[PDB]
RNA sequence: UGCCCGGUGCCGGAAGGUCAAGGGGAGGGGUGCAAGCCCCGAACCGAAGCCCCGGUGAACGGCGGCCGUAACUAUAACGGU
């Protein structure tokens, strides 16, 4: 199991720069989910919990 | 060749506590007609030792536990007790 634990550690990573899946930029009001990728302009509405816009569209 | 002198040992301490023989003799008793003779006996004075106050490890000896915490884990330099 600890070998499987390190498999998680070694396959996640790394809360670092070149490592985004979505980019919430509050200085020009956008949240690009650079995976798919939607471009909703309601930044302070996504921070309130409107992730359906992303979840359902990113289950593909 | 580190840290611990609380326990034991040794060393130092004319204070204080306790301390035997002895000294002392408030008081009490036996007996005698009696002077007397004989026996207990409090306060108080009275050594070392012990207590007490310190020192001492190349003196006898002794030198912990639990809990949490860091770039996603592990570990814990750090903290709490
Ligand atoms: Mg110390
Ligand atoms: Mg000692
Ligand atoms: Mg000693
Ligand atoms: Mg001592
Ligand atoms: Mg002595
Ligand atoms: Mg006497
Ligand atoms: Mg006498
Ligand atoms: Mg008489
Ligand atoms: Mg006497
Ligand atoms: Mg003495
Ligand atoms: Mg002793
Ligand atoms: Mg030594
Ligand atoms: Mg000891
Ligand atoms: Mg940690």
UniProtKB/Swiss-Prot annotation:
Methylated by PrmC. Methylation increases the termination efficiency of RF2. Is absent when the factor is overproduced. It is found in: Cytoplasm. Transmembrane segments: none annotated. Peptide chain release factor 2 directs the termination of translation in response to the peptide chain termination codons UGA and UAA. Acts as a peptidyl-tRNA hydrolase. In the presence of truncated mRNA in the 70S ribosome, ArfA and RF2 interact such that the GGQ peptide hydrolysis motif of RF2 rises into the peptidyl-transferase center (PTC) and releases the ribosome. Recruited by ArfA to rescue stalled ribosomes in the absence of a normal stop codon. A TnaC-stalled ribosome binds RF2, but the active GGQ motif is prevented from engaging with the PTC by TnaC. Belongs to the prokaryotic/mitochondrial release factor family. Interacts with the ribosome. Recruited to stalled ribosomes by ArfA, in the presence of truncated mRNA, ArfA influences RF2 conformation so RF2 can hydrolyze the peptidyl-tRNA bond. Biotinylated tnaC mRNA can be detected in a stalled 70S ribosome-RF2-TnaC-tRNA(Pro) complex. This provides a mechanism for the protein to regulate its own production. This is Peptide chain release factor RF2. It comes from Escherichia coli (strain K12). The chain holds residues 303 to 362 of 365 of the full protein.
């Amino acid at each position: 199991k600890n070998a499987e634990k390190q498999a998680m550690e070694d396959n996640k990573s790394d809360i670092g720069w070149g490592s985004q899946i979505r980019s919430y930029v509050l200085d020009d009001s956008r949240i690009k989910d650079l995976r798919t990728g939607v471009e909703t302009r309601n930044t302070q509405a996504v921070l309130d919990g409107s992730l359906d816009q992303f979840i359902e569209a990113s289950l593909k």
